[PDB]
Amino acid sequence: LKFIDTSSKMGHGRFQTPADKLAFMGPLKKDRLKEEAAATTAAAAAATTT
Amino acid sequence: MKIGLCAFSGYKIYPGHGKTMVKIDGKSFTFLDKKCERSYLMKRNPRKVTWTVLYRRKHRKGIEEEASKKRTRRTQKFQRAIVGASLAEILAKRNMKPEVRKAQRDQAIKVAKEQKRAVKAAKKAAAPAP
Amino acid sequence: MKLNVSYPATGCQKLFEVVDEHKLRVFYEKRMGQVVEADILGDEWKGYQLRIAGGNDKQGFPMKQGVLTHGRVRLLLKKGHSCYRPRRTGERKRKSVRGCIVDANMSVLALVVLKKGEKDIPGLTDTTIPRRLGPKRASKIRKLYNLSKEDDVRRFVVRRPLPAKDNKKATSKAPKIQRLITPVVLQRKHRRIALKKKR
RNA sequence: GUAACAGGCAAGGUGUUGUAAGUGGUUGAGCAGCUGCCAUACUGCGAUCCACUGAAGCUUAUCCUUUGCUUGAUGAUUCGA
RNA sequence: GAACCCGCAGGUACGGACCAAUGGCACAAUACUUGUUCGAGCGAACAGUGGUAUGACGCUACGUCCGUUGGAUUAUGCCUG
RNA sequence: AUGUCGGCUCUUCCUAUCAUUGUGAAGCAAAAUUCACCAAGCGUUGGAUUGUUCACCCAUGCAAGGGAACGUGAGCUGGGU
RNA sequence: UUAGUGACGCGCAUGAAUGGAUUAACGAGAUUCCUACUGUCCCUAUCUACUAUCUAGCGAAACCACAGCCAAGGGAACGGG
RNA sequence: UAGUCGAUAGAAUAAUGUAGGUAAGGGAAGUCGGCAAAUUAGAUCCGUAACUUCGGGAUAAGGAUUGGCUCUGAAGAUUGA
RNA sequence: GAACUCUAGAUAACAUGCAGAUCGUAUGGUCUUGUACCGACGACAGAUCUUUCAAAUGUCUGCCCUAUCAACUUUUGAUGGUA
RNA sequence: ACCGCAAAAGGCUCAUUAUAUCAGUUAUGGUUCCUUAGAUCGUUACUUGGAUAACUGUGGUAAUUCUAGAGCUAAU
């Protein structure tokens, strides 16, 4: 066997793997937002301490 | 089975996955999937279709990896002696610094004066004889 | 495939044959100018870096830099470009041309080695397949030797002795130092200035 | 079986469509209307474009998933060697 | 001049499955668009699914996958007599 | 008052077997076809015209065998009659 | 191409206001060829709304000797008995 | 605006319907027969035959184009300077 | 046929070529002999100008048959103005 | 081999083509002209710079040919 079509049957599967999705799909409002929230929370923590 | 690229939406075409149309001429167009097929059959400009990687490049969305590659090459690989005087001898002539070079110059010019004056004088001597 | 790999630091080139697919595979989807580590290529080439200098395929229209297709493409080409040296003035030809990126269709890779690893391969490293000829012109003897206008050639020009073999008293050829600041040409400078003023 | 739970969500994955509202920009062929002691212009209108925005909406009822939320956990009849 | 059994690959016709791909359908899903209406706008409603492009859970094609092996013995060739 | 014919649709059987199986004949050398047998398990079609069975043609396939329930009008069509 | 059209016409049984011929325009008229078109078909499939269905309510009729399992046989020469 | 919302309803929304649609690729092969269905359709512009009773044929055939926004021109009335 | 931008210039501005880092003949004058200074011919460049080989367009006038071809060109230059 | 110049035509044929071509007649203040002939250039390296052929070596496709790659070296 040389390949398995792991793409979404949900219906018209572009991308086999969630890693292949990240390659084609560029900086979506998404994961980056979560990181941005975390940094904000740290700045808040730092202000309270000072 | 080779992962090709969708010639309108830039999306990778994993084994079988859709359809490839070959024109009469024959210009092969590769489609991931029906949505692409139908949009371009309907004659949409991919450049106004915000679903293509093609427009996204033009429209400056995302890129990063491709833009990092481009800049800086000078390149100077070697001196070129061998045959003329077997390497050491060219290396010897090459090295001998300006002060010694000016000596070689000037000595040769001094030797040359005598031959020029001699021939001018000799022709001046020769001319009376007829 | 076949690697025509050159150590051009000694001016050498040798031929090697890669039978094994995995070693071969390393080159796949690498472009002209791109850096390959040779340790995956071979046990002989540990620490060797390979620059893809060139290639020629089967069905061998020569690799032309930057047409990028792995297959082949038809191009209209012009004076003096890569894949185009035309015999006749304003000649334009359409050729098939193979493009720049290494794929399994490639008969011969042409590889310049960037770096000498840890191990001397004999035909590349040991034997010097030479550095052809000494500059000849007063001007290019100038910067190779770093003679800068005070310090003049005459006897610094490469004198090679060549016997004509049979049946010959071996001679040495000087040769011709062009644009020496030979007085004859100097006096022609004087003459050109002479004609301008007088007229 | 207060839990291998079950169900309704919200969340996340997965889809679908194709870039929301709102806001900012003379993006924008242009146009009105007032013109200085001098450069000059601005105030509105303007399909559409761009940025926020590969976004917003929609997602299976016959999707996938859940230490997230809350909630359910409390009816009837009949049968023998 | 045996496309002739061993052996091999495919298809046909028939039958039964299966929906992954590919194709078909429309969620009156999403977008767009016209006419009208909601002051305009957003977002919708009405044109008995408004039209149009795309179109999923799902169904289904023209799509694809699967269709066993002996005995008894006829015809018949035969033993022994 | 027992719903004409064909064609559409759909059934099962029968052989007096054209093809296919296994076979015996041949003035069958091969190829090919003809004859006959066990055999109806399995095929026997797509069209032009005709209302037409029948017929007549065209095309393919190794082969385009023939009959029975005047089949089949609360199945159609109503074309001929 | 048992169709049509132009011909031929000893025309079974054409024919001259018993009107004959030709014909523009017109026809929910009869007929033939080609094209565009399409689910007319190959070859089927899916979808909307309302039913059919099930349920609360409401509620007929046709028809009915007696009524209703087949096969063959005889018999008014085709039996549910 | 005025008048309705009563056409017994609910749940299911099966087959088969009815009434309304769509269907790749091929495109009438269908059938008695293009029946049913689809194509086509408005407007403006261009172009326009056979035949003809000169009126038509004619919307012949065959082609082009249509939104929105933003400008511009043309097309009227009346006194006044 | 001249308000020619004519072969050429002045005033005000412009851009960007030219002016040889050639070669072969043959070397002289003069030394403070730097290998100095300065020098003839014509080959090939070269810029302005003419000339020459040319050339493209434009004037005048002329061509067979045909009316069983009488109106033709202007859809989109047809024919004229202006730019 | 680079560089420069020729190859724009000799030659051939007369198809398209009927005022078109073309002859004679002429113009160019409506323009271009290598060349050749003749004349013209006094508004801080003076003889510098490095890259490529030919070359050398190694190659490609069945091929004419087209050239890839590596290393030299010239200029009117």
Query: Secondary structure of C52-119 in the HEC alphabet?
Result: EEEEECCCCCCECCCCCCCCEEEEEECCCECCECCCCCCCCEEEEEECCECCCCCCEEEEEEEECCCC
Q: Which residues of B111-122 are buried (b: 16+ CB within 10 A; e: fewer)?
A: eeeeeeeeeeee
Quick check: B47 and B55 in contact, CB under 8 A? yes
Pairing status of strand C108-115 against strand C2-7: parallel
B62, B66, B72, B78 alpha-carbon torsion, rounded to 10°: 170
CA of A43, closest CA in chain B: separation in Å? 28
Q: What's the CA gap between B94 and B104, in Å, rounded?
A: 14
Tell which of B5, B12, B14, B54 to mutate to test the A interface (max A CBs under 10 Å): B14
Q: List the subunits that have 3+ CB pairs under 8 angstroms with B.
A: A, C
Q: Which of A7, A12, A27 sits opposite B34 (nearest CB)?
A: A12
DSSP type of residue B25: S
Q: What's the CA gap between B80 and B90, in Å, rounded?
A: 10
Rounded CA–C1' distance between B27 and G40, in angstroms: 38
Tokens standing for residue C64? 């032309």
Residues 85-104 of C with CB under 7 A from strand J: 85-89, 93, 95
Q: Report the candidate in C130, C123, C66 with the shortest Cα–Cα distance to residue C98.
A: C66
Please compute, for residue C114, the number of CA atoms within 13 A of its CA located in the half-sphere on the CB side: 15
Q: What's the CA gap between C82 and C32, in Å, rounded?
A: 13
How far, in Å, are B81, B101, C109, C178 from residue B85 at the CA level? Answer: 7, 18, 35, 20
Q: What's the CA gap between C194 and B58, in Å, rounded?
A: 64
Pairing status of strand C171-173 against strand C160-162: antiparallel
Q: Which of B11, B14, B61 sits opposite A26 (nearest CB)?
A: B61
Please name the method used to determine this structure: cryo-EM
C179 nearest nucleotide via C1' and CA: J47
Q: What's the CA gap between C130 and C49, in Å, rounded?
A: 22
Q: What's the CA gap between A23 and C103, in Å, rounded?
A: 23
B120 nearest nucleotide via C1' and CA: I28
Q: Is B126 on the interface with C (CB under 8 A)?
A: no
State how far Cα B40 lies from the chain centre.
39
Quick check: C116 and C48 in contact, CB under 8 A? yes
Helix (H) or strand (E) holding A49: helix A31-49
Is residue A27's beta carbon less than 7 angstroms from any atom in nucleic acid strand D? Answer: yes
Quick check: A5 and A15 in contact, CB under 8 A? no
Q: What's the CA gap between C18 and C102, in Å, rounded?
A: 14
The total of other beta-carbon atoms located within 10 Å of residue B90's CB is: 23
Q: What's the CA gap between B82 and C167, in Å, rounded?
A: 26
How far, in Å, are C34, C40, C190 from residue C25 at the CA level? Answer: 15, 10, 67
| Type of residue found at A2 | K
Tokens standing for residue B75? 């390149």
Which residue on chain A is closest to B16 by alpha carbon?
A5
CB proximity list for B59: less than 8 A, separation 6 or greater:
B50
C15, C20, C22, C23 alpha-carbon torsion, rounded to 10°: -20
Q: Report CA Rg, chain B.
A: 38
Pairing status of strand C108-115 against strand C49-56: antiparallel
CB proximity list for C116: less than 8 A, separation 6 or greater:
C7, C9, C47, C48, C125
B80/C132 Cβ within 8 A = yes
Tokens standing for residue C183? 């007085």
B17: which chain A residues are within 8 Å (Cβ-Cβ)?
5, 7, 13
Tokens standing for residue A42? 């740290």
Q: What's the CA gap between B63 and C147, in Å, rounded?
A: 51
Tokens standing for residue C139? 């001007």
3-state helix, strand, coil in chain B (%, to 5): 40, 10, 50
CB proximity list for C105: less than 8 A, separation 6 or greater:
C57, C58, C59, C71, C98
State how far Cα B16 lies from the chain centre.
40
- Expressed in Å, this structure's resolution amounts to 6.0
C140, C144, C148, C150 alpha-carbon torsion, rounded to 10°: -90
Tokens standing for residue C88? 């006749």
Long-range CB contacts for residues B68-71, cutoff 8 Å, separation at least 24: none
Q: Report the candidate in C141, C173, C123 with the shortest Cα–Cα distance to residue B79.
A: C141
C188 nearest nucleotide via C1' and CA: I39
